[PDB]
Structure formats: structure tokens, C-alpha cells
Design a binder for this molecule. Sequence first.
Ligand SMILES: Nc1ncnc2c1ncn2[C@@H]1O[C@H](COP(=O)(O)OP(=O)(O)OP(O)(O)=S)[C@@H](O)[C@H]1O
Ligand SMILES: Nc1ncnc2c1ncn2[C@@H]1O[C@H](COP(=O)(O)OP(=O)(O)OP(O)(O)=S)[C@@H](O)[C@H]1O
Ligand SMILES: Nc1ncnc2c1ncn2[C@@H]1O[C@H](COP(=O)(O)OP(=O)(O)O)[C@@H](O)[C@H]1O
Ligand SMILES: [Mg+2]
Ligand SMILES: [Mg+2]
Lengths: 103, 327, 292, 330, 338, 161, 282
Amino acid sequence: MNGLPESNEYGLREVRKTFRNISKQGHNHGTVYFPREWKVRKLQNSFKVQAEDWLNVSLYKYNAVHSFRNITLEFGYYAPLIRKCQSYKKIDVVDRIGGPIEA
Amino acid sequence: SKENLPWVEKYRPETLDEVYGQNEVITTVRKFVDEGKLPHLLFYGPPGTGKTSTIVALAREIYGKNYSNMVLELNASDDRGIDVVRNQIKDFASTRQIFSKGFKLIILDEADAMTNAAQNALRRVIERYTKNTRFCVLANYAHKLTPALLSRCTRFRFQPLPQEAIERRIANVLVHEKLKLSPNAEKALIELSNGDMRRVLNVLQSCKATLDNPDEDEISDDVIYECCGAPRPSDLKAVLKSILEDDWGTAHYTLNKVRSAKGLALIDLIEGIVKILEDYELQNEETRVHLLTKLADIEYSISKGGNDQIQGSAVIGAIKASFENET
Amino acid sequence: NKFSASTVHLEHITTALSCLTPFGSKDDVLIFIDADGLSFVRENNHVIKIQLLLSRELFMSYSYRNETEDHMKLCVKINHILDSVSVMNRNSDDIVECTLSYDGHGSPFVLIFEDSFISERVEYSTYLIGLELDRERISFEAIIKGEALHSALKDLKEIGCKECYVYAKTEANDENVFALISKSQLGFSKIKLPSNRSILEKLQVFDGDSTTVIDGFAVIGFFDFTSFDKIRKSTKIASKVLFRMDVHGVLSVNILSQLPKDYPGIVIEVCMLEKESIDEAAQTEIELLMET
Amino acid sequence: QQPWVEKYRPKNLDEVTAQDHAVTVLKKTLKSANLPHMLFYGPPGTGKTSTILALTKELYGPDLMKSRILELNASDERGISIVREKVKNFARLTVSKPSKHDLENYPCPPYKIIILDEADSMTADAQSALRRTMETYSGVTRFCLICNYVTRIIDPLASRCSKFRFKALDASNAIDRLRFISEQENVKCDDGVLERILDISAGDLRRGITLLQSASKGAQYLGDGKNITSTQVEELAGVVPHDILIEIVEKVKSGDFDEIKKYVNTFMKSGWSAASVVNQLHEYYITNDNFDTNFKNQISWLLFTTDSRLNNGTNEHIQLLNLLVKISQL
Amino acid sequence: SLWVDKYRPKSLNALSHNEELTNFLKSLSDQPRDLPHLLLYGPNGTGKKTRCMALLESIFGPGVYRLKIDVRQFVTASNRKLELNVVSSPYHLEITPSDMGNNDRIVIQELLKEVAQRYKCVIINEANSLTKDAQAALRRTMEKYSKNIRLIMVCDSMSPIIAPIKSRCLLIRCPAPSDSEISTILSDVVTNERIQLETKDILKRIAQASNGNLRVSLLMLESMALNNELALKSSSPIIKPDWIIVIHKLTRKIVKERSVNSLIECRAVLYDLLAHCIPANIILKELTFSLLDVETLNTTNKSSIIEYSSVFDERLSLGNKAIFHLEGFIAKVMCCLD
Amino acid sequence: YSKLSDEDVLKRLLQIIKLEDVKYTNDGLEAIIFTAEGDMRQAINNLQSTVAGHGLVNADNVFKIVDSPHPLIVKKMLLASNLEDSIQILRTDLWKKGYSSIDIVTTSFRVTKNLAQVKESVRLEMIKEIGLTHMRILEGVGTYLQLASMLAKIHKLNNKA
Amino acid sequence: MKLKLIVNGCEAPDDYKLLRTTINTVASLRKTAILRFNSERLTIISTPKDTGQLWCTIPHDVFRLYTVISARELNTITMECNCDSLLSVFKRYDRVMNQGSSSNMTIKLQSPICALGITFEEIVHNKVIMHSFKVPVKLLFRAQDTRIQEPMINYIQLMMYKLPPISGEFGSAFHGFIRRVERYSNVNHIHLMGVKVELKIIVNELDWHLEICWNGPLDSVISTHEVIIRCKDWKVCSKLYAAFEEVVLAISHDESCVFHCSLDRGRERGQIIYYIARSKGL
DNA sequence: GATTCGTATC
Ligand SMILES: Nc1ncnc2c1ncn2[C@@H]1O[C@H](COP(=O)(O)OP(=O)(O)OP(O)(O)=S)[C@@H](O)[C@H]1O
Ligand SMILES: Nc1ncnc2c1ncn2[C@@H]1O[C@H](COP(=O)(O)OP(=O)(O)OP(O)(O)=S)[C@@H](O)[C@H]1O
Ligand SMILES: Nc1ncnc2c1ncn2[C@@H]1O[C@H](COP(=O)(O)OP(=O)(O)O)[C@@H](O)[C@H]1O
Ligand SMILES: [Mg+2]
Ligand SMILES: [Mg+2]
């Protein structure tokens, strides 16, 4: 709804109605927490820096224009694996870009 | 050089008696002027209703020759921020009258585009220097104005132009331009005007241009529909009949043939069918809901664009499915 | 060309146009061109108006070939005009020769500068196209020297002076008082001019008919100092400033700054509106502080 | 040299085809000087820019055009400040004096024209500032607004500006223009060709001209000197072949989710556009007489929903699979 | 370097996986003077960029691959520095909206204004990333400057491209190759560098595991070659991207456990995937298709899943925060499966 | 400061009539108070306009110079039982009277925010529908069809399915 | 890393004026400056990395003593210093002789971030007043010095204009011609004109035009040449023209503009080059 | 506003 006040009103009203309908006595609630979206943004910034480094080294030692989309899809995992065996069996970036994906 | 002007800015009223339609507002402001007391006016209405013309003619009537220095007109074309309101408006409505006595007039054309801080600063100027200055506010959207500003301003509502005002203005234009208009074309023009005088003037100018030789030639409804590219009522009735009674293939063929005969747009047909179906008597109240909702999303999708034939088939299917509820 | 004029005294034109600098820095300026000369009329918020009178005798090649109309009116910007007339015409051996030109409606306002070594042509496109006191209802008339009024205006500017007051009272013993009371952060500030004929050469207070010289009553003028400071630069080159105000709250300033031997100086006319002064008790404090 | 779209751009108002009403109004405006503020709206590639450029050429000529025309499009900044200073200053400017040649060979109207192309991308505040700018200086400046979506123009501007809808160029509308271009470019085609071109190019002459140019280039590369057939036209237009559509319909008829999913994966492996195949399916299902009224209504609504979703820049694969699954359960 | 660019066909005649598209490119390159603006659409990894480079070599001669990488600075409406990288080459320019977000309009505006001042070809990778304003500038920029510039943009799923731009371009389709052609390319690669290749069936397995992607298949081949000690085995496992495995595990968890705690775990997995800079649209696509390969779901469940997928990917296209739509889709799937 | 009551407004108004000595009618004073909606300045402005435009202050003259508050009209439109009555009220009281569609949508949002005797689920559904209509109006589609569809959806959610 | 130098303004006027002009120019251009102390010349560099670059060459014979020793190649000591502190020191030292003196200015590199011990003497009237100053500087690394290079200029379309010396009859007129565009407040771009000798300053805008032209005699050392540049760089060009007798102007068609200033010390000549990029395209 | 741990008071 592009940040209209009606959107906030409807969302809060629906959440309150949903939690009121199921509310019962003796409930043991939990502890609320701040959203983790800022941590995700920081991780995305680190991934962006590492992908810029990968694209710089791939465009300096040789001529190969790869898109950031391909870096995130395949080159973020396949290329470190190629650089791993290539190096141990014997380029700069050997670890998975942005760290490994867990669970 | 009034002959070198568009018809919209050629027939702008110069006196209050030349403004048609809003008889109540004109009479009220004339009584205000004759009594010598004028409050902080506020004009509200749809575009083309005659607010700017009315206020300009009123200011000319009040100040016959001192209009240049007794009237300060600001609109959206000029900056009207907090600094302009703080300095220029205060300086104008802080000095004494030159020699005309009376009061100073400040016109805020399209005040709905002003910022909230500007209106907050303007309210104190309005309620402070009201002894020698009166403010006029023109706006098409009242939700963009501060409630305090509406509180301190006397609200005048400009209704859409009725039929008789449109007839009188069209007759004046025809007399001035030595043009002829058929009654059917007259009815067509008022219906498409939608209470707007500017649309009427533009369509009349386009129709005069359409005629090969302007004199000795009447303007018929065919000329109107050809110039403005609108569907004829007969075409809309035929399309609705084909959709409601005939099967799918022939209804699609009829819609395609009607649209390709003159290059008609699907949105115009949608509006025509909506207008016609409003006069229909539906005894289910679910057909109304289905029609309104489906046609609303179809119109919105047309506004965003997309496949035209798919949208036409969607219109046909929506009408058929909605009228299947009437069993 | 419908109008052409050439001049060599660019300093006088520069100062005359810089008299308009206190007004809007970058706005429009409206120019009349007729047989008598050319004039620059500038207005701000319909409350103050300035006007120059550059006579024909000031120029040495004034032609004015126009015959369709008695005068030609053109509206252009003022800042670039000031920068154009800001040559300063140095190197006295080779004097810069200006050439104003205008070829009627639709033509640019050309300013050709010739140095016999440097040629500069400046063209300005024209744009699409009141405050006068009646000469019957004058409340007071004063003739002040330019230097004293300029010093008073500068002192008022240096102390803030959000608002200003004008005092003009004549007495039966041929004593005249003229003071500038100001509202500022300091409070009450007054600057009273001397009664000698060197500065206050003439001060006459009338009964609103410009004829009867009445004594013992004071004329009050409440003016916004933003409009008052517009005349500060005009009075800098003025030799004698003439002050007039009617009962309708209009203040007219006649700058008389008396180079060609025939042209009668530059005539600068400044007209200014008076504040409404809703508070009636302010003038009471003004006259109470004036009596003491 | 130049692409056929720019090579065959109209130069006069007579070369513009199928838009008879607006062309006639502008031609009668040539003999007068009461031209109003125009609002050119319609489908893309209908000739609005060509029409306004032709009218601008005819009104002033090549010399007075540079001084009497200001053009602003989506490639330059058009914010509220830009409208409030540049447009207002240009409208406030005095009309330039025409020369003897201009006044003897061209009508030279006493006004100037400000053209705001791609006005649908303009913010509402800019249009609000534009309102009184056009209204006040109407006798010294004229305004032209060109857009594709009328709803993106605010109501006051649509009221002030005269509306000139540009009709979509169908087969009958632009068949003469396409034939003229083909004859002038020495292009040989079978009977029924250029008609399939204008059918594929739904309401667009630019796309049809580009398709004809590409077909001509392919024929020249082949070198056999043979007429272009409709089959080649559909191939380089991106039209799904009828065999693939028939297989799609047959697999949809058997309501098996796995077979439909596998065939859709294979189909999107071929790079076919979802919009074109959705349009082809709509044509096939609505045209065919083997389906009843209820099925046609449901299929029309489903195709409308799928087209609206696809027009929002969503995933082609998911939308196509969902549409075909919904059809198979109809 | 990697085998993907080691065996990239530089010339037009070296392209041997489309045939008809190669002939069409030769037809276009016969007379480059009348070459219009080109738009190439097809599956990712097909080789559209290789076709564009081969066409540019066919027009301007060898030397188009002499890329110099430059650094450019841009300023938006406010004071800001935009460090945009430009990979220019003789008669060739490269622009990509990957690095730049909503500020993608002013960069392309300045670049095209400067380059447009024979013609110079400009390549725009990932034409779908524009925000409908750079497209608004681009339509006029190419309509008015067609004499001194040519635009060739590659993209996949060209639906988010506005209608005027698609009307201003030639539409060129690049279908993905069959499994046999990918196997032939892999056979040529392993002939150029011997890899033992015990069985031809593993090449077909790699081709089928890539779904018509040359780059993915070559990456898989290189990975297996380097991991298996410069050899290949008939029983060698199929290597897949890490996020594919994570999405498959997420699908298994969704199918197995359907609860609020499982919903929070799914949210954590989605947050990890988002932090790994994987676009949410393809995340939803892969999750939806991984749900459809589950053999324990009936046809009604699959239909509900695909309907929710369509609704939520439309919402994500019309949305701002991607986590809301992904969480909603997962919750709808959980509420439908139970 | 609370909103002014009808009695205090009536007292101040009557003081002004007694000071100015103008003719009045009790029905006219009631109409002035009803239109003022607790605003004293609005009441004074409306009374002055009525006296200066028509003289005698009755309900007829007051309702012919000033208009009934559009929040009340919108509230009546939203609380209608059947769709036909709501459509007729909307048309003949906001579209023929010259009220902008965006004003109608904002007034509907405010009324729904301050609407009593309705369920919370119904209220939030109508809020969502009004928000969708507001988005459609803001994006450019500001026709009467959108308002009619909004009323139809509101009635559909009111009478359920 | 042993840098020490001594400057005597009264002993050699011209090179001291060259140094003062270079310091004034680098201070007016932007904050901070690059001082490259090569063993045979000193180069003062102002690199903003569109905005211009100033590359002034100062020979070692300018200073009375030029011991420069470092482990880098050719004893290259590169340092970044704030111009304002150096400008203040130079103004103090200039006023020292203006009040009457002939004392030398001793500069030593006393300790990566270091400082120069610029100390000199002054005598009021037979009193000893020692003026001691310490300007904090940073030591640029060797690779960082290699990242700074003088931009070469192509000669395919570049054309030279030998501007008249300011000491000649036409020098004052040409200086007035150069500064004729500086008296406009609302100017940001100057579009030059040379056709093949005339120099034309053209400032074209929406509603005003300017056609400053030079009708005097000019020489081109040995076709249209247009480039549009910002007004601030033109101010620097005017300031450089006044302080240098031998001034050479080079104009490239829609590429760049070069303002070459040379001081004939003959001996190695001190030169100042101000490379200016076009603000926008023709 | 909810949970969890620690005190002061009744
Ligand atoms: N009542 C009327 N009588 C005669 N002409 C009218 C009337 N109303 C409008 N017009 C014509 O329509 C033109 C435009 O109307 P305006 O009053 O200038 O604009 P407006 O009515 O204020 O609408 P907005 O809200 O400002 S866009 C006028 O110049 C007249 O020519
Ligand atoms: N009626 C027409 N007659 C002749 N050529 C036409 C006509 N309509 C379109 N064209 C051709 O279509 C091509 C593009 O026309 P334009 O007017 O620039 O497009 P458009 O109408 O502006 O659509 P846009 O720019 O996407 S809103 C040119 O090659 C024109 O020759
Ligand atoms: N005809 C072909 N023969 C061999 N390899 C090819 C061919 N076409 C494409 N490729 C391979 O595809 C890889 C990258 O494809 P790319 O151009 O990135 O696809 P897309 O343009 O769809 O992103 C290249 O490394 C190249 O080796
Ligand atoms: Mg108006
Ligand atoms: Mg166009």
C-alpha cells in the first residue's frame, strides 16, 4: 500500500483482532526482540564488498565480465570450490563469498 | 488580440454577470460587495466550474482601475513556502491602502498545493490583518487544507455546471463564432462535458476545425463523435445487447467490429456500459457487486495497460458472469 | 533599430543602476524608452517603487527612431544588466564606448561595449509585460541633505531596526524637529536631525491640504525598515533629499544628485507605503518620548 | 543508412496516416492562429511525436523552430523547481520576430509551443505548477502534452489541455503505409503478408516497420530472391508455432499436474515469452466453439488475471504454470 | 582461468548451439548500417551475451574483447558520489544496473548523453533491473540519438520491460540448447583437456542437472574434475549450488513440520538466504518448484501451492520488504498442507 | 479545551443577534448550530453570510447558502443497508454536489476510524478496502466507478457470503 | 629521510615570487597540497582525485640549499601539507622583508606524520625575534606517489595561443579581456572560441548571450577550437596570467584546456601547468 | 506491555 495510513491501521487492527480471538487465561508469553533486518543488511554489504573484490580480480588478471547476479547464484559457491582444488592440488579468493549457507 | 487565443482563454468572463451556473454564489458575493462587507472567501469545486473567473471578476468589480496594486494573486506556479508567506504576504497585508480605501484582496489560487507550515503561518496573518485585508482561497481538494484554515474561511461550494448554464454559454459561443449546432450534437456535447466548461469549449473549437467550411455547415453528433473519438450511444447499446443476449463468439465479433469501425477505445466503451447499466433494474444485488468490482479492476488494468483483446474478453465475461446471478 | 544610444560615462550609469541593488537582487526590471530618455521602474511586493530618469542629454547618440508609439516598454532582468554596466571603463586613454540598442517587439536588448581592442556584445531577451502620492493632501515636506540622511539610515541599519518611525513637527518660533524613532532589539532608538539650514534646509507641516502651514502638531509615519533601507544606497550619491508624505500613508523620496554639461543629474523617485499600525498606543509612546 | 522507423518518419501532416481527426484539426490550425493546448495520448507507436514534429515543422520552418520551440522529455529533469523556473521563464519570454523569408513562406503564428513529451512520468506537483503557467500565458505560449496513460495526467491539466486520442494502427489503418514502405524499399511478400505483420504489431506501426525491415534483411541474406512468407514473419516476431500451442492445449486437456509441469519447464526452456503465449491461448480458447459460456467466462477472467500479473513484471514461469493448472481444472 | 571463458566462442561462426539464431545474426551483421536496437531474451546461461559479443566482432572486427575497466563518478539530485564501474572497449560500452539501485536513472542518463555526443554499440546487461524511469529516459535517448548510438540489451523474462522500449527494439529470442548439444560442448571441452570420462552418461547427467545452462554445466564439470583428482566416475555425485541444497532442506522441513516454531525456523533460513544476496523472486520460484517435486503431495496441494506462489510473487513484485511475502507464502503452504 | 456545546454556541449566537438586531428563526439557528459542528468561528461566519445574503435566517436560506457537513453524509453512506441506497446517496450527495473523490475517500477513512456500533473485523476490512481505493485514486484512477466498487465491496463484507 | 632547505627572498626575487604564486594558487584551489621533493626539482601538485590539476615545477637552484636524501628512488620525498599553514608562514616571511630585513628562511624536516621546522629571523628598529613554525604533514608512500602522475595531453587537435606578456602594451588590455567575464555574478560556464587569431569568450544561456572578443594582436606558436569550462578555473587562469610574463594557452576541441606558465630563469626554467577538464560537452 | 529476579511491606 506504499506506506498509506490505512495500511498501518488495517495491519494493527488485524493483528490485534487475531490475538484477541485466540487469547486465553493462563497464557505464558515470550520475550520480544528487535528485527534482525539490519544484520541482514550488514551481511549483504559484506557480500557486496566480497563480490566487488571477486569481479575486480576477475577483470584484472584476465578479461571476464560476470554479472553480480551470476556471482550470487553460481560464482559465489562454484568459483571458491574451483580455486580450492586448483590451489591445494597445485586464485586469491578461496572461501565462499559471504560465508557458507547453513540450514 | 482575442482572436489569436484558444477558446478556453477567449471566453473567460470579465464581469460577474457573465458567470453562469453558480447563481447562489454569485448572488451572495454580489450582496457582500453591495453591503460593503466581504469575509474571507473560500471557493471549492471541481475543475472548470468557474472559481478563478468568478474571483477575478469580483476583484475587478471591487477595484475597477486599482486591480494591479489592490490585488495580490499567488498560485502554484510561484513559490509559496514558509518564507514567501512570512515576508511577501505580510508586507502586502501590513501596509495601508493607497487611495482606494476598502480592503486589500489576496487570492491564493490552488491553495491545496501549499505546505502545512505555510497554512499555519497564513492563518495568523488572516486572523490578524483582517481589518484591512481579506483572503480568498481556491482549491479542488479540501483534504489538503488545514482544518483551522477552513475554520477561518467562509466556504463556498462550486457545483458542476448544470444543463442550462452549458446551453447559455454554448449559445453565446455560437453567436460569437457564427456557428450552427444540432440539438442532438448539443445533447452529446453536454453529456461529455461532465459539468466542465473547458471541455465544452475545446470540443466546440475542435468541431469548428473539423468542418471543411465553417459557415453554412451545421455541427452534428457525428462530427462531435468523430472529433473527440467517443462511441455513439447506438454502438454502446448494440455492444451491450450482443454481450447480454448473444453467445460468446458473436459477442466478441460484434465488439471487435464496433471497435474497429471507428478506432474506439475500450475504456470509453466501459464507461458507456457502466453509465447504461446504472439505469438498469437489478433484483439480486449480487449482480451489482460483481459488475462494479470486475469493471473496476478491468478499468484499473487498462489504466496500467496490457493486452487489449484480453481486456475486452474480460469485460464480456465479467458482464456475462455478473448477469448469470439474475438467473 | 527603433532605438539607439551611445555613452562614455559608464560610471554614472553604473551608480544609477546600483541604486536599484537594495531592491530585488535577481528579479525583473521594466524600461520605458521615449524621446526624453529612458527610465527604470522597479517595484517590490506592491509596497515600494523606485524609478530612474536617465535624460537624453546624458547620452550623446540618442536617436529613438520609433514612431508607432510614444514610448517603448520592455521587461528584462536587472542583475545581468548591472554586470554589463559594471565595466568600470578603466585605462583612461581607451574609454569603453557603450551602445544601447532595441529594435522593437521581439528583439533583444543589446549592450555593445567597444574598447578598440576588446569587443563585447551582450543581448538580453525581453519578457511579457500605482504607488504615487496625490499632490493635494501632503502632510509634511522636508528637504534633508544626503549625507546626514545616509548616516542616519546606516546607523539604523547597524542597530537592527525592525521598525522605524518618522517625526515631523513645526513650531511657531520657527523651530523644526525631524527624528527617526526605531523599534529594535535595543528598544527605543531616535536619531534627530539638526535644526540648522545646512542639513534641515526646509521642513513644512501642513493640515493635509499642502497649503496651510500649521504649527505645533506632529506628523507620524510608521514604515517597515525593509522598505526604508531601499533608499539608503540612493541617498549615498544624493546631494539633497526631498521628503514628502500625504495623509494616505505614502512616502515619496526625491533624490536630487546634481560628465555632460546639459543633463540635469539623475532623478531617482522612491515611493513607499506606510504600515497600518493597528496598535494605537505605540504612537502615544512615540509622542511621549518626543516631548521629553 | 538509417533504420526504417527513423527513415520513414513523417515530415508533413499529410504523411501521418489513420489519425484523420487530429491531423485535420492541426491543418485547420495552420490556416489560423487559435491553436489550443493539446494533450496527445494513445498507444505506443501511434505517431504522436511524429505528428507534433510535423506540425512544428509546418508552423515555423527550420529556422524559427530553434527559437520558438522548447522540448522537455523524460531524459531531462522535470521537477517542481524546473517547471517553476525554466518553463515559466520560457512562457514569459517575448515571441521572437520572424524574418522576411519566414513570414513569406510560413504562417509564423504569434505564439510559441512548449512540448512536454512523456508527461505520464511527471509528478503531480509539477502539473499543479504547470496549470496557471499555461492559463496565464496562453496568448503568448502554447503547451503540448504527450503521454500514453491519460490517468497519469491530473484532472485540471486534462481540463485545460484539448484531448486528441491517437487511434491504434490496425491492419486496415496502416496497410497503406506498410505497402508504401515495402514498395519504396523493394520488398516482396506473399498475399496476406504485412497483414499478419500488422496483426502481430497490435496498435503499433514502429514494431511492424521493424519486423518488415528484419524480414527484408533475412531475405537479402538468403539471396534466393523469394517472397517473404507469413511463417518467417511469425518466427522472428516471437509468435509460438501452432504445433506447440496445440500440444499445450492437449496436455492441459488431460488434467495431470506432473505432465503440465514438465511440459511447462520444457516450454520455458525454449525462451518463449509468456505474454505472447497467453495471448495465443486467449485467441484459441475464445475463438473455439467447442466450449460453453461458463467455461469462456472463467477462461476470460483467468486470462485477464494472468495478463495483469504478467504486466507487473512478475515471474513468467510461475504465472504460466498457474494459468495452465487453473485451465486444466476448469 | 575457468573453463567457462576458456571455451567461449569469440566469433560468429564459432557458435554451434542455435544454428538458426546464428544465421539470423549473420543476416543482421550483413549490413550493420541499418542495424536497429536489439533486445535478446531467453533462459539464463543460454549464451545471449556470447552471441552479442560475436555479433560485435562480426561488425567491428576482432578487438571488441579488449576491455578496459574504468571508474566513473556521478551525482544525483542531492550531493552524492556514485562510484560506477564502466567496462568499455573499442566501439562497445557495458552498463549493468546490478551495482546501482534506484539511482540507476541518472547514471545511464549521463553515460548515454556523453557517449551519444558509424555508431558506437552500447550493451546493457540485465535490462529487467531498471526502475521504469531509466526506461523512460532510455526510450527518448534511443529514439532521438539513433544515428550515433545503438542499444543491445540482454535480459530474461522481459515482462518488467515497458511497452515503448519493447516497441522501439527488435525482439530476438535465444532458446536454451538441448541436452545433446550441451553434451557435445562438454565432449569438446574434455577433448581439449582429457578428463578420463569413463562413461558418456555422466555428461548427459550434468546436462540434465543444469536445465539448459551452459555456465552451470561447465562449472559442474570443472568442480567434479578438480574434486575427483583430474578424473571422472560414473557414480560421481551430482554437485549443486549450496542455496539449492538449503532450499531443498527448507522444503523438507516445511513438508515434515507445520507449526509456528517451524515457521520461525523457516524465517531464519529465509533471512540467511537474503543475507547471502540471493534475490527473493528466484527464492520463491525455487521454493515453489521444490515443493512441487515432493511426491507425498496430492494435486490439490500442488494447485494451492502454485496459486499462492503466483499471488505472493505478484505481491513481492509490488512490494518493498521481501521477507513479508516469503513468510506469507510459507505460512500459506503450511496452512494448506496440514 | 473541549468542543463547544450546542447551548453555549446558541447563547453566544443569540447575544450576537441581540447586538446586531437581525431577524432569525429557531429552526435557522438550529441549522446554523448543526452545520457549525461545535466550531464557534464557523457558526459566526455562516450566520454573517446568511444575514448578508438573504436577511431572515431560516433553515431554507441557511441550507441554501451553506452545505451539510460531508463527514455526516459519508457516515450515512457507509451505514446504508442495501447497496442501491448507498450508491444513490454517494452519487446525489457527493458526485453531483462537486466533491472530489480523494476527499470522499479520506472522509470515509476518518469516519471508519471513528465509526461505532460495528465489529472490529468488519471495521478493519472496510479500512483495507478504503486503503485499496485510496491507492487506486492516488495512482490516477479517480473515477466514480472506483467509489462504486468500494461501496459494493463494503456492502459485500457487511452482509457476508 | 633527511630534508632541509633554505629560502632567501631578497637574494633571488623571481623564483621566490614563483614559489609564492604557486603557494597562493594551491591554497586558492583546494585545501592540502602534494610536495614532491625530487633530488633535482621540487614539484607542487594539487590533485583533487572534472576539477583541474596544477603541476608546478620548481628547480633545485631556486633555493639556496637543497639537501634531499631518502631511501626511495632519486631521493623522492613526497609529503602532504595544509596550504593554509604554509600560506600563513609565507605571509609572515613576506612581511618580514616588507618591514625591512634580509634574513633567510630555514626549513628542516623534523619528525607516518612529520612536520617542517620553518624558522626564520626578523629585526625591528637591532632586536632579535626568532619566528619558529611547525606545520604538521603526512608522508606519502612510494606506491601512493606512483598513483599520482601528470596527465599527458594529445596534440591531434590541440592548438596553442601565445598570450601577450603583461609587461607589453597589449598586456593590460589582454588582462582586462580575461577578467571581463569575471564581473558577472551569475556565470558558471565559459565557452571558448578559436578559429584559424582570435580568442572569444562566449557565455550562452537561456535568455542572455555574451560575445567578449579580443581584437588586439595575438600569436599562435607553431580549424575551430571550442571548449566549455567552469568560471572558477578561469579565475585561476587570470591570476596565473598576471604573475607570469610567458603565458601559453592550449585549447583542445571538446576535450580540455591547458594553461601553461613559464618563468625564464636563464638555468632550468620554472613552469606552472594548470590542466582544466571541460565542465560539459559542446 | 510482557518476563524474570530482587526487595520491602503487610
Ligand atoms: N460559469 C462559467 N461561465 C462561463 N465560463 C465559464 C464558467 N466556468 C468556467 N468557464 C470557462 O472555463 C474557463 C476555465 O475556468 P476557470 O474558472 O479559469 O478555472 P477553474 O474553474 O477555477 O477550475 P480550476 O479548479 O482552477 S482547474 C474560464 O476561463 C471560462 O472560459
Ligand atoms: N500514423 C502514422 N503514420 C506514419 N508513420 C507512423 C504513424 N504512427 C506511427 N508511425 C511510425 O512509428 C514510428 C515511431 O513513431 P513515434 O511517433 O515516434 O512513436 P510514438 O507515437 O511517440 O509512441 P511513443 O513514443 O512510444 S509514446 C515512426 O517510424 C513513424 O513513422
Ligand atoms: N555456442 C556455444 N558453444 C560453446 N559454449 C557456449 C556457446 N554459447 C555460450 N557458451 C558458453 O556459455 C557461457 C556463458 O554464457 P552467457 O553468454 O553468460 O549466457 P547469458 O548471455 O544467457 O548469460 C560462456 O562461458 C560460453 O562458454
Ligand atoms: Mg483556477
Ligand atoms: Mg514518442
